[PDB]
Symmetry: C2
Subunit: 115 residues, 2 copies
């Protein structure tokens, strides 16, 4: 699969489990259309979001529901959600891993694009 999302918790030093993730694709009319979604696994990963056939060039948004994650742990967070917005280009490199490292008032996100 061409798109994987990984979410980690910097407060507890753990995968961020059962985090809701929504992927959207930008439509011609510039609105965001649901594309795929899921919850992270026990390893903080969400696999299986799409297939090579379905994941065509375009602008995509990954929304990670960090607020709900923190609230279920009893912790007061700053953000409503985390967002990752990027163009998929299949000129060269074919697999995208979108990683997010969560803290209450900060987050870091990285993209690893390989093979």
């Amino acid at each position: 699969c061409p798109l994987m999302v990984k979410v980690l918790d910097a407060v507890r030093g753990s995968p961020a489990i059962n985090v809701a993730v929504h992927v959207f694709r930008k439509a011609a009319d510039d609105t965001w259309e649901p594309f795929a979604s899921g919850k992270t696994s026990e390893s903080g990963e969400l696999h299986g979001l799409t297939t090579e056939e379905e994941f065509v060039e375009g602008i995509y948004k990954v929304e990670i529901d960090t607020k709900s994650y923190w609230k279920a742990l009893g912790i007061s967070p700053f953000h409503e959600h985390a967002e990752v917005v990027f163009t998929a280009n299949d000129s060269g490199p074919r697999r995208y891993t979108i990683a997010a490292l969560l803290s209450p008032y900060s987050y870091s996100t990285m993209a690893v694009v390989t093979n």
Copy 2:
């Protein structure tokens, strides 16, 4: 100034100068309404976006135009922009500094909130 934005460039070890920033506020009908915009100075800072009177409670989105930054520097980055989405002023007025540390395939953002 209740809202300040600070942007740094992790490739150069410097302020990220001339970075466009657009702030949106969610309206009663749930769409993102333009609220304020500006660009970072030579110190990577953006002051003057709003006033304590205008910066009412709401859900705000700070969009940092990182792709246009990397490309005005001749570089092809991953993200379209860096987004910071948060509820503001729901326990009374606060001052928010939204900071972002930029790399071509990653960024970190953090919020300092003071009363």
